[PDB]
Design a protein around this ligand. Structure first.
Ligand SMILES: [Mn+2]
Ligand SMILES: [Mn+2]
Lengths: 148, 148
């Protein structure tokens, strides 16, 4: 503990915070807040916050995502596109693309994520999936934590 | 022209800007950008920017809005609730509520607005509507430009 880094957190009091329980977990240092759901809105707007050195789950599913970076910076992969991201970049994630957000070692990443209210469950990669993904050099670099 | 105020503008190049043509118009100094639509997303995410001293159209309709303030500050009315707003406040607008956003004289107001892709056309108030609205003191104060 010679170094204890600062980290602000974005909150809207009255909206519940879900901190995800880590164990063998495919994610790391993630919280979610649901900003808009219900009211006959067919969409949901969520806010995800990924703590320093964390990541969202590498996954895919039928439903699309529209992401707008809201806080900090980090990296995203969609399909085999890897990019650095910062507020308020738009990340468009078409149905079935593999995707993941990664926070740098020194900073949290926050982003808005719009999805359909009615939607399928995420699927995680098999060993085969990971190996096809890793055949790209930038993708392997991203998954190794080395995109910066 | 002794004073020419600064005003930054939020843009995502590749997304079209719609500047609304003013005449007898119920709005003033408004632009829109559609950040997410299509991809089997049943929602749209738009970005509205209201220039200093401007306002969105005072209207109502069946479809709900979820608004997140993104830039500057200003005032909002929903139903008879009037509040000051600033980034990244959430404004929830239930179906059929009268609503309007107002930019201060000295600053632009920017906000995200999530709606359903399939939705009804806005309705503007009749003289009767305005008079029922104006029966509240804070609402009349807001519509007179005096909420600050
Ligand atoms: Mn996903
Ligand atoms: Mn409206």
């Amino acid at each position: 503990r010679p170094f204890r880094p600062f980290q602000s957190q974005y909150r809207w009091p009255g909206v519940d915070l879900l901190a995800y329980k880590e164990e063998s977990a495919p994610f790391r240092s993630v919280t979610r807040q649901v900003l808009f759901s219900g009211n006959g809105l067919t969409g949901e707007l969520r806010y995800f916050e990924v703590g320093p050195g964390g990541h969202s789950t590498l996954e895919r599913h039928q439903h699309a995502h529209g992401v707008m970076i809201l806080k900090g910076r980090g990296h995203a992969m969609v399909g085999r596109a890897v990019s650095a991201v910062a507020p308020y970049d738009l990340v468009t994630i078409p149905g079935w693309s593999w995707h993941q957000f990664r926070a740098p070692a020194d900073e949290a990443l926050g982003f808005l994520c719009m999805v359909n209210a009615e939607r399928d469950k995420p699927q995680l990669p098999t060993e085969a999936d990971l190996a096809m993904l890793r055949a790209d050099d930038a993708v392997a670099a991203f998954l190794d934590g080395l995109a910066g």
